[PDB]
Design a protein around this ligand. Structure first.
Ligand SMILES: NC(=O)c1ccc[n+]([C@@H]2O[C@H](COP(=O)([O-])OP(=O)(O)OC[C@H]3O[C@@H](n4cnc5c(N)ncnc54)[C@H](OP(=O)(O)O)[C@@H]3O)[C@@H](O)[C@H]2O)c1
Ligand SMILES: NC(=O)c1ccc[n+]([C@@H]2O[C@H](COP(=O)([O-])OP(=O)(O)OC[C@H]3O[C@@H](n4cnc5c(N)ncnc54)[C@H](OP(=O)(O)O)[C@@H]3O)[C@@H](O)[C@H]2O)c1
Lengths: 502, 504
């Protein structure tokens, strides 16, 4: 059995057939991955770092092919795709630096004390090592940076874990080219092909078997709350439960104070640009804005409403995503106590939408907190700041939380931050949540449903730690200790001794 | 409460004085609600203040040491000499986390230096730190009524992280937990902090623990106990509308590999083995439950020496009637199997006999039910055909807290093939020593692959245990005045911070 990718612009099948893999290929892939797991995590840091950089170069070399195919499969602009390939490549290079530095080892040493009474203090040293093969499900809205060679794959390979990707049916051709790049990189580095494997197929039994395979030791997922939670449950029902890192969705609450409105005349313009970026197909898209019932807000709303009406027709990633959006916006727009403004569009294109309501009705409709993936957003007009702070106390988990204010509001903002810290992974001040910097301090995730594991990040240097577990070595002789823990520190890595700074 | 219950005298099986309440979902809700109410203030306290609280709890514990020891002894049958040492362990454990919190290292401050003139788009100012998850539920261990219970490692590390704690008191030692709770109550009063920071719930109705694990205000769980109950509670924790981290240590048999040269080098190795497996009457989670050795004369002698020592062991009194009944029932069943020899010490119920089983790697491969742990003064020796056989066996070992190797330089070539295999199944590897002792320091890893732990990427003992109760938050473009002290440009707390990848 085979299947074809769908032309995002026409809804018709694109050339090139892809295989429909099943539990048979899963078993084969997982078995081979397990077979090379030990050697892969034992490679010199410099070697695995080299592999990551080689993958980055190979990807750049096929940029032409990737962009051309991804554009037809997703309808994302070639310029957006060109920027994403660069993000993807530099992301891989970041982890190459991380691995090379040996920081991920997190070497910790307890200085022994043989003359301690009653009992002597033993020599104990610990480091982090790879969990084993990792299964990765890529994101449909970021076919490159969050997919086949995305953040989850890059950080897992960096940690020393073989990777098996369940290719997203929304962009099989894109993933195939990326897989060919990784295949080339492994050949040049002269490393086992089983280090990375791409599986394809439009039958869900595939993903379920992968998540349930006993040789799979962790999962990386980016997608819907429905499918994500289903797979998460599968992962924890296994004879041996495994970590499941899934980003399921968020509404990214934004709080705008009057003074911020007075300070930036184009704030409404910025808002619309943020919510319509990539036709609103960003997980960090500001889905709800809380503002006060003042003239500034009423003007903000009218400006935003006017821009929305003016907005051009949008083509979503797939006809399927197109359908869910249309039915949900028309459906919500008919709910109690909600005003909606639509742009002009005819299927297969969708219209952008801006909903407006009061905090009274927001409290009455908890379903409005659920994300509607597409170029739509909601504005909630609050009675006063107390009303606004009250609302923040009940917010569900989110990737981000944004605040627009000036010094005049700091007294109230100082009370709001502690509440937002509890529900979001990243707080943004006087800016928009859309952009996600791939650096060292990033936290892309947060409380459920933003992530199934709030104590982690799927983007940034710290993402590597999701695929590692510690091992303590007690009283082992120097010759038997891994290089990272040898007394002389031959790798010259950062290590923490008796609590001192590493 | 509608009902009360009594603790059981570990030596007589009769009820001890003092009745304890049987809490239900009602007290769970009250406790969790109150804990949630003080969670924010608790995590925002100055590091020095929360550090002081931990030290005050340690002092209060020491002040009631005589009462704790006297009660714990009757409730558990553990020697007072052992309990006196555990109180010190408990107190110094709290002081360790006091040092951790005070140092501000747990914040794990990380900063990305901004670059406003970067093209196409500028690089924003991003800073991140770890903050408390919120209220934490703790289930204490029956075999370590002090260091792994009410004021044990999970409670200590959680309070250190800034999380309120609700302990579901173990029914095996309610009186011990009560005294410990009174100590924490005193410490909170002295520090002038909310009582809701710590709450002890008691009761012998399982509905209690299940309601606690499922309460929406509870944000994480610490558990030390059986795989049956532990896995059940773990599943509950992940079926919640909002799944929460569950850190449970469920069991292990701590595989030990002994090479011929090691037995030659230490004539008393068998003696050491027996001492390790019978320590605390074998009621250690790190007890060496299975020893793999080669089919050589040294091994036969080792076995005969161990067997002789086992025959002379003093009758043992276990922790609870259930652990007792479970031990007796399980050792007799296994001994009746074919292909396995068992040696018992002399004992009459309720006391139990120590036991040493012996079998071949073939029969071990034929009876997978033998890898199942049996909590008590019992252990198994598996005689292997050769080193290759030994290595083949290590490849199929279940997760364990520890893995031990006894060898000399002679064996290093084979030991180097074995370590990589053991790294994959154990949280801590011990060389030429025994797994029983667990050093409370900075490098410890007490846990490991399932079932040793439900979250292999963590430790329940050691300074790093604090990270189980924390989650990161990134702050982007916030002004200095709105940022937490740990992330302020001037670093007013003078804590270790990592900038642009540099070493903290
Ligand atoms: N918050 C985040 O970080 C974020 C960002 C990006 C993506 N997502 C979300 O993803 C949604 C866009 O739809 P999507 O197509 O990317 O999501 P999706 O339907 O959840 O699909 C994601 C992947 O999981 C697979 N899958 C889903 N449920 C599964 C199950 N129960 N059994 C087996 N496989 C399963 C899909 O297989 P098929 O290939 O068969 O569909 C696909 O490969 C939006 O809501 C977007 O916000 C989350
Ligand atoms: N790996 C380590 O770090 C470590 C250290 C020490 C102890 N342990 C393990 O602890 C075990 C000792 O057995 P145990 O009898 O003390 O353990 P247990 O039966 O698992 O009980 C532990 C606690 O969990 C509660 N509990 C268990 N089942 C529950 C359920 N399904 N619903 C609600 N509450 C539940 C018990 O309540 P009741 O009080 O009502 O029974 C008790 O307070 C041994 O297997 C030992 O290896 C592990």
């Amino acid at each position: 059995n085979v299947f074809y990718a769908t032309n995002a612009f026409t809804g018709e099948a694109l050339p090139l057939a892809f295989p429909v893999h099943t539990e048979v290929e899963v078993n084969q892939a997982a078995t081979a991955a397990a077979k090379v797991a030990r050697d892969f995590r034992r490679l010199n840091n410099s070697k695995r770092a080299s592999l990551l950089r080689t993958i980055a170069s190979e990807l750049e070399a096929r940029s032409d092919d990737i962009i051309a195919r991804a554009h037809l499969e997703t309808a994302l602009p070639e310029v957006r795709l060109t920027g994403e390939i660069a993000r993807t490549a530099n992301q891989l290079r970041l982890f190459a630096d991380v691995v090379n530095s040996g920081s991920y080892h997190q070497a910790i040493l307890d200085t022994p004390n043989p003359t301690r009474a009653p009992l002597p203090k033993p020599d104990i040293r610990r480091q982090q090592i790879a969990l084993g093969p990792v299964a990765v499900f890529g994101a449909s809205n970021f076919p490159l940076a969050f997919s086949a060679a995305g953040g989850d794959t890059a950080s897992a390979l960096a940690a020393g874990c073989p990777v098996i990707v369940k290719g997203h049916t929304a962009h099989p051709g894109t993933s195939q080219i990326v897989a060919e790049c990784i295949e080339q990189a492994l050949k040049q580095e002269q490393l086992p092909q089983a280090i990375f494997t791409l599986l394809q197929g439009n039958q869900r039994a595939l993903g379920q078997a992968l998540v349930s395979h006993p040789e799979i030791k962790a999962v990386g997922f980016t997608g819907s709350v429905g499918g994500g939670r289903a797979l998460f449950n599968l992962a924890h029902e296994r004879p041996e439960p495994i970590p499941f890192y899934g980003e399921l969705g968020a509404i990214n609450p934004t709080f705008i104070f009057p003074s911020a409105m007075r300070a930036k005349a184009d704030l409404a313009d910025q808002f619309v640009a943020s919510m319509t970026m990539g036709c609103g197909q960003f997980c960090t898209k500001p889905g709800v804005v809380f503002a006060l019932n003042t003239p500034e807000t009423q003007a903000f709303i009218e400006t935003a409403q006017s821009l929305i009406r003016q907005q051009s027709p949008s083509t979503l990633l797939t006809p399927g995503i197109r359908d869910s959006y249309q039915s949900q916006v028309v459906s919500r727009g008919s709910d109690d106590g909600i005003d909606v403004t639509f742009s002009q569009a005819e299927s297969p294109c969708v219209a952008s939408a801006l909903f407006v309501t009061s905090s009274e009705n927001w409290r009455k409709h908890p379903a409005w907190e659920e994300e509607i993936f597409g170029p739509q957003s909601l504005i909630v007009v609050c009675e006063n700041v107390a009303d606004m702070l009250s609302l923040s106390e009940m917010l569900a988990g989110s990737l981000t939380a944004t605040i627009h204010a000036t010094e005049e509001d700091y007294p109230q903002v100082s009370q709001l931050i502690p509440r937002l810290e509890e529900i979001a992974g990243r707080l943004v001040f006087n800016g928009w949540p859309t952009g996600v910097e791939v650096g060292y301090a990033m936290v892309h995730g947060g409380p459920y449903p933003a992530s199934t594991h709030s104590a982690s990040t799927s983007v940034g240097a710290e993402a590597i730690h999701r695929w590692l577990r510690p091992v303590a070595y007690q009283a082992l002789p120097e010759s038997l200790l891994p290089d990272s823990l040898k007394a002389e520190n031959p790798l010259e890595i950062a290590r923490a001794v008796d609590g001192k700074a590493a």
